[PDB]
């Protein structure tokens, strides 16, 4: 029976009312139930100092109900709360719910990829690379790779290869990993270049790197970029392995690319 | 069967339909009857 | 505690100014502790108990003042203070009353469901005691009988107690069928009854009420010469939505095979 | 003598039932349980029927390697508390099988609400579920490990919640466990519908209706109406249950027929009383109807003591005598305002006067106000004036009054012969049967 206190005004009651939200909100489900307009009324409001903690006991509410885009709607504007409470199955059920809004949104992110996508709250992806820290610090190759592809988007997961003194693998064996699974090639091609770069640049000359993007990726450019150090290092023991594979597994047209680039 | 609330809580019957409309009504079933033609 | 708390027990409500300085006083009352998280050292109980009692009072403050919302609050509220942890609430005599107001307002509102649930929060005081509960549900077995005539002869024993403005309500939802049937400017007087509105053989109160908002009907007729009802009488134009639940059931059919 | 039996056949109770719900439940998915792991409800009253015995099942549980074999037959062997229900933590943690967990935690631990001691148990069983809630709580955190509780421990776990009711119940009420009901009906609500929440919702409105009275409107923004219905029973009572909130929400017409199907919906047996003192309370709605027929077509012998004040009662509905009507109240009103009658004494008066012009309606097309008012202990052709409108109440047979002084020029009402009304409700009706037909459809695709 709190809309009687919800008749006031001022806040400076509403903080016992609050108060008493979360204390009886267990029992009093479809008090707030038909509230929702007055929930509104304190949130839109810009001088009602709570509108944060009322999207929270909206949370509630619809917590007991389970609505999507209310929780999408307490991302926006539960802010702070929103945020740094993440120790509940009341809070990440919820947010679980709006990590599968997000990767939903990331499919939409690949469906069109050139501008003009659908706008994104910083908090929705906020808790996204905030969960994603506990993922760095967890350290754990699942904990990388996973959101690192989960968002379908190079950037985390060029800074999954940056993480502490570990991998020995991941650069090695990020490949095949990606090989393994992959269904799209249209960021596949990307991905697939992106590792390879830094395979180059890695502490050690790698093989199955252009030994799987020469063939999977074919191109005249990475051939040649083989062929230019490989040579340029002056050993042949070391490009014994990729130029007998230039032959060994390529087929026709990839030697037209590369006898592009032979003599230069 | 425990079913979690209820463990704490023809000789003369098929009549009772007729017995109970008869209850207060023509308790003696002729002796008015036989005796009505004579009343007018 | 906090003075000017009990000082107006003889000079209650003359004023809205006492009673809305007794607002910011209870306003702050109400900002001293809390509502009913804390228990032990029962003295920060026993101000609750004394907000009990002087928002008993501030609920006749806030009806003596006519307010629907405010007096609801506070009946919300006191409801809440009556669900209190307090085992040992002692006698409020104001509780037999205050729930007799809020049950004749609730049925002044036509809320039934809310009159049992009221029953059924209390099935122990209501027994024999509790007069001004008792009282309205001898008027419940009144209204139990429909009651047209039983309003009068109920509001016979209610002389004195200011349940005016709610006794009002119930002259208020006191119905209009006889209205809705026969009259309508002609029946040349409905008197004898005992109906509150069908009084008053014919001021403008009346008047007012047999041309108030038209003839409640509405379209193609008057009660001067009745529908009997309201006139429907359509078609079977409906056999041809049932042509169409027959178009859907073949659909179905073929769902099905 | 006898006792050398059950350690054969209550040793083969784990043996057939346990042993193959585990072994065909880690393999053949949805086929692991409910076949026969799911005749936990009947054979595991039945072990706490059929068959010191306190210490033995309940020592040296988790041993290592699967060797319950040995384990099981050494309680067999020993027939010849204070740390004992959590020694099946204390031998160790149990670090495997864990869809045994809660088997071990609930058919071991349970036999003591069989055998009542109620003192120093219950807060024991209390501890046992304190475990078995941790596997409750942890099967999300700690357990990432397969299904394993959803398809058979979900079943399981109801039924060991209805066992948590008989623990909680028999000292006291519950609070924090509704919150974490609706907990669990969080991990329930969209990953596997468990009933679990009507569950504790049939035991919420059932010390509700004695002791809180805010939830049938959260009931209604709560209805999750669950149309799986498997066993029946639950849904049964369940239904009994909010029949008895919409006798006392006053929903009297809805009432009769939901109750109806309530009872028809209950296969039972056992004619101590169950069918037939839930069944008293559930045609009380039709004491509130103002048409109740003779209840000699409802009368089980076993009833006879308790209905001792309800064959009178129905006798006073029958009839209309208030000597009658107060006798039956003063002197037979015992026994039930522990189910809650004093609702009917208002409005037995209503029984009356609706019995009465329902035979005097179907009986008289037209029939007079100043005669009416004296069929039966009527007042006054006023009150007949006024109880012929409150006899119309909610568009009854039509009753015109002769609105001269010819009382009332009512008839009788026509067009049910067979042209329209009943062609409007047969589309309904055979939508009805199409909804059997979606039954044989789905009796198809039971394999």
């Known amino acids: 029976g709190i809309i009687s206190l919800l008749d006031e005004d001022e806040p400076q009651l509403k903080e016992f009312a609050l108060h008493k939200l979360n204390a009886v909100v267990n029992d009093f489900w479809a008090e707030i139930s038909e509230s929702v307009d007055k929930i509104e009324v304190l949130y839109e409001d810009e001088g009602f100092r709570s509108r944060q903690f009322a999207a929270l006991v909206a949370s509630k509410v619809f917590y007991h109900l389970g609505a999507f885009e209310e929780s999408l709607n307490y991302a926006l504007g539960a802010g702070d709360l929103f945020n740094v409470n993440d120790n509940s199955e009341y809070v990440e059920t919820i947010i679980a719910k709006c990590i599968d809004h997000y990767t939903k949104q990331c499919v939409e992110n690949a469906d069109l990829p050139e501008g003009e996508k659908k706008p994104i709250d910083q908090r929705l992806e906020g808790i996204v690379n905030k969960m994603f820290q506990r993922c760095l610090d967890d350290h754990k190759y699942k904990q990388a790779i996973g959101i690192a592809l989960e968002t379908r988007r190079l950037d985390v997961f060029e800074k999954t290869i940056l993480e502490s003194n570990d991998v020995p693998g991941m650069l090695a064996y990020s490949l095949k990993l990606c090989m393994s699974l992959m269904q799209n090639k249209q960021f596949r091609n990307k991905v697939l270049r992106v590792l390879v770069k830094i395979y180059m640049n890695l502490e050690k000359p790698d093989f199955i790197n252009v030994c799987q993007c020469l063939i999977f990726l074919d191109d005249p450019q990475a051939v040649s970029d083989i062929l230019e150090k490989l040579v340029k290092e002056d050993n042949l023991l070391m490009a014994y392995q990729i130029c007998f594979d230039l032959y060994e597994s390529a087929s026709q047209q990839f030697l037209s690319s590369v006898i592009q680039n032979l003599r230069t | 069967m425990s079913e979690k609330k209820q463990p704490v809580d023809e000789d003369n019957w098929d009549d009772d339909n007729v017995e109970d409309d008869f209850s207060n009504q023509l308790r003696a079933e002729l002796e008015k009857h036989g005796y009505k033609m004579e009343t007018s | 505690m906090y003075e000017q708390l009990k000082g107006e027990w003889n000079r209650k409500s003359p004023n809205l100014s006492k009673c809305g300085e007794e607002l910011g006083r209870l306003k702050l009352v109400l900002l001293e502790l809390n509502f009913l998280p804390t228990t032990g050292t029962k003295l920060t109980k026993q101000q609750l108990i004394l907000a009990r009692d002087i928002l008993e009072i501030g609920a006749q403050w806030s009806i003596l003042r006519k307010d629907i919302p405010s007096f609801e609050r506070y009946m919300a509220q006191l409801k809440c203070y009556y669900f209190d942890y307090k085992e040992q609430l002692p006698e409020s005599a104001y509780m037999h009353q205050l729930l007799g107001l809020n049950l004749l307002f609730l049925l002044s509102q036509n809320r039934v469901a809310e009159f049992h649930t009221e029953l059924e929060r209390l099935p122990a005081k209501d027994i024999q005691t509790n007069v001004y509960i008792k009282h309205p549900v001898s008027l419940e077995q009144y209204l139990m009988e429909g009651s047209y005539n039983k309003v009068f002869l109920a509001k016979g024993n209610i002389p004195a107690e200011s349940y005016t403005f709610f006794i009002d309500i119930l002259l208020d939802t006191i119905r209009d069928e006889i209205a809705g049937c026969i009259e309508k400017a002609y029946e040349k007087i409905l008197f004898t009854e005992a109906t509150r509105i069908l009084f008053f053989n014919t001021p403008k109160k009346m008047t007012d009420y047999a041309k108030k908002r038209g003839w409640v009907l509405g379209p193609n007729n008057y009660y001067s010469f009745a529908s009997q009802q309201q006139k429907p009488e359509d078609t079977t134009i409906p056999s041809t939505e049932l042509a169409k639940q027959v178009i859907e059931y073949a659909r179905q059919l073929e769902m099905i095979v | ?447």
């Open chain 4, 1 to 447: 003598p006898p006792p050398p039996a059950p350690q054969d056949v209550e040793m083969k109770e784990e043996a057939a039932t346990g042993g193959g719900s585990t072994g065909e439940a880690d393999g053949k998915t949805a086929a692991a349980a409910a076949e026969h792991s799911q005749r936990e409800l009947d054979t595991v009253t039945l072990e706490d029927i059929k068959e010191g015995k306190e210490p033995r099942f309940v020592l040296r549980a988790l041993r290592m390697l699967p060797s319950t074999s040995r384990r099981l037959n050494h309680y067999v062997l020993y027939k010849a508390l204070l740390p004992f229900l959590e020694e099946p933590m204390d031998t160790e943690a149990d670090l495997q099988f864990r869809p045994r967990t809660g088997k071990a935690a609930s058919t071991p631990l349970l036999p003591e609400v069989e055998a009542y001691l109620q003192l120093l148990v219950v807060i024991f069983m209390m501890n046992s579920k304190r475990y078995k809630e941790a596997q409750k709580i942890s099967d999300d955190l700690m357990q990432k490990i397969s299904t394993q509780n959803r398809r058979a421990l979900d079943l399981v776990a109801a039924k060991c919640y209805y066992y948590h009711a008989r623990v909680y119940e028999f000292l006291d009420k519950l609070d924090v466990v509704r919150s974490f009901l609706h907990a669990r009906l969080r991990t329930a609500t969209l990953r596997h519908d468990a009933d679990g929440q009507a569950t504790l919702l049939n035991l919420l409105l059932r010390n509700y209706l004695h002791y809180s009275l805010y939830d049938q409107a959260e009931k209604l923004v709560s209805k999750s109406v669950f149309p799986e219905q498997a066993n029946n029973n639950e849904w049964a009572r369940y239904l009994y249950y909010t029949g008895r909130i919409k006798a006392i929400q006053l929903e009297y017409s809805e009432a009769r027929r939901t109750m109806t199907n309530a009872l028809r919906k209950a296969p039972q047996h056992t004619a101590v009383g169950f069918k037939q003192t839930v069944h008293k309370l559930l045609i009380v709605v039709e004491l509130l109807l103002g048409e109740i027929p003779d209840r000699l077509q409802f009368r089980q012998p076993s009833l006879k003591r308790s209905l001792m004040p309800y064959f009178l009662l129905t006798q006073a509905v029958r009839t209309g005598n208030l000597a009658k009507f107060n006798q039956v109240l003063d002197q037979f009103g015992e026994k039930f305002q522990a189910d809650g009658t004093y609702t009917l004494i208002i409005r037995l008066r209503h029984n009356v006067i609706k019995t009465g012009v329902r035979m005097i309606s179907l009986s008289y097309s037209r029939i007079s106000l100043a005669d009416i008012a004296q069929k039966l202990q009527l007042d006054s052709p006023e009150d007949a004036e006024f109880i012929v409108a409150k006899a119309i109440r909610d568009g009854v047979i039509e009753a015109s009054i002769n609105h001269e002084k010819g009382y009332v020029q009512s008839k009788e009402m026509i067009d049910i012969y067979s042209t329209r009304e009943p062609q409007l409700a047969f589309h309904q009706r055979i939508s009805f049967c199409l909804d059997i037909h979606n039954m044989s459809v789905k009796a198809m695709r039971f394999p």
